[PDB]
Structure 1
Amino acid sequence: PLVVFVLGGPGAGKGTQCARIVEKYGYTHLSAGELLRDERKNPDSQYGELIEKYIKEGKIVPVEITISLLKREMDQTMAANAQKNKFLIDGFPRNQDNLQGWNKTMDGKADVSFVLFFDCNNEICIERCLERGKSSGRSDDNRESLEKRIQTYLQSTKPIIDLYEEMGKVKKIDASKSVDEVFDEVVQIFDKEG
């Protein structure tokens, strides 16, 4: 079970590239944020009632639940099809405590091949989020909530990038270019490694 973590703030173009990587390379894309939201909404589910307790208390849902959901999706995907063993994971990790939790709980159970980091300047990210907003119903987010979210994402994930750099595992991508230019960069990486 091989994992690639996909990092980058909002507007960085992750969504488009992940879909592209899934088609060409047969990776399975997991969204940590959407797996949690769906577990919460099923009160039927494994962890729905547990998540309900944390919500009631005004408390953050522990990363341990998130890792369990990621691990269950990986285990189920492979029990159906032992060949579908490569995973793109986004929405996790969000900070270095999340990442320590992963490394303590998942060693001997999954290998992180590498980390993809979609990088470009705040302004271009922000414009993307705003134009996606306008052109559909409308966004909750205005310019200054976006800039705040981008700033604190870069601050939170910097130690993750620093750490994976140290072991030669960061593949930086220039996310300011157009969809197909960026994907050419993504293809150079995945054709090499895997």
Structure 2
Amino acid sequence: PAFSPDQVSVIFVLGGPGAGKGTQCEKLVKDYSFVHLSAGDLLRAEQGRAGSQYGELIKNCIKEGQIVPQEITLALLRNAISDNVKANKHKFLIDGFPRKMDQAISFERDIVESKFILFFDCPEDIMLERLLERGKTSGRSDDNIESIKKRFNTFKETSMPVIEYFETKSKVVRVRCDRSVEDVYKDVQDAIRDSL
């Protein structure tokens, strides 16, 4: 791997869209030394980057709730991790990655093996109400019912197998998403304290 788990500590934060990953990660960075890297954010940044040859591809993948090819995704993640390590940041909360088996195996084999996966176990009806609310609040392009259904489908068909994979390696820590932000955070903190 490009790094050893001693140089770079990686916690994958997984769960379906609207499970509260971004919300919890943002709280965690206030209390812990972790750097929060969001795959969705990295992709959205590249999508709007002047001169990007991936603008249309990412735009379409996001609207359709599709998994952007790992080559593009991994490259953006690797660059962000590198910039941080350079700046002496060695602990990362990578939210929303890996979402497909290929990128999961490539990441762990070429970059670094993750410490553990923090999985936000969330009922779909809960995720759905949060995304519709978020759609109104923030106006993210894909926070519309048509794209949301596609995101849930992809999550179940494509992303869940990744959770099952890491689960067999005993690296998954499940946290229930369906509580208040503060109550969920308490469990997140407990999981992290126990998992370090």
Q: TM-score, normalised by structure 1?
A: 0.81
CA distance in 1, matches of 2:94, 2:184: 19
SS in 2 for 1:112: coil
Computed over aligned residues only, the root mean square deviation of the Cα atoms, in angstroms, reads 2.6
- Are residues 1:98 and 2:97 paired? no
Letter in 2 for 1:67: L
**Counterpart in the other structure of 1:63:** 70
Distance 1:132 1:2, change over 3 A: same
SS in 2 for 1:111: coil
CA distance in 2, matches of 1:142, 1:71: 30
- Are residues 1:163 and 2:129 paired? no
Matches within 5 A, 1:101-112: 101-106=106-111, 110-112=112-114
CA distance in 2, matches of 1:103, 1:135: 36
SS in 1 for 2:185: helix
Q: Percent identity?
A: 46
Structure 1 residue 61: Cα displacement: 5.5
CA distance in 1, matches of 2:113, 2:129: 35
Q: Does the 8 Å CA contact 1:30/1:87 hold for their aligned counterparts?
A: yes
Q: Which runs of 5+ in 1 are unaligned?
A: none
Q: Give the aligned length.
A: 182
**Counterpart in the other structure of 1:20:** 27
SS in 2 for 1:88: strand
- Are residues 1:128 and 2:130 paired? yes
Which among 135, 150, 153 is matched to residue 151 of structure 1? 153
Q: Does the 8 Å CA contact 2:134/2:143 hold for their aligned counterparts?
A: no
Choose 137-146 or 173-182, whichever is displaced more. Answer: 137-146
- Are residues 1:186 and 2:188 paired? yes
Distance 1:70 1:128, change over 3 A: same
Highest Rg: 1 or 2?
A: 1
**Counterpart in the other structure of 1:75:** 82
Structure 1 residue 166: Cα displacement: 1.0
Structure 1 residue 30: Cα displacement: 0.8
SS in 1 for 2:18: coil
Q: Does the 8 Å CA contact 2:135/2:144 hold for their aligned counterparts?
A: no
Matches within 5 A, 1:25-44: 25-43=32-50
**Counterpart in the other structure of 2:3:** none
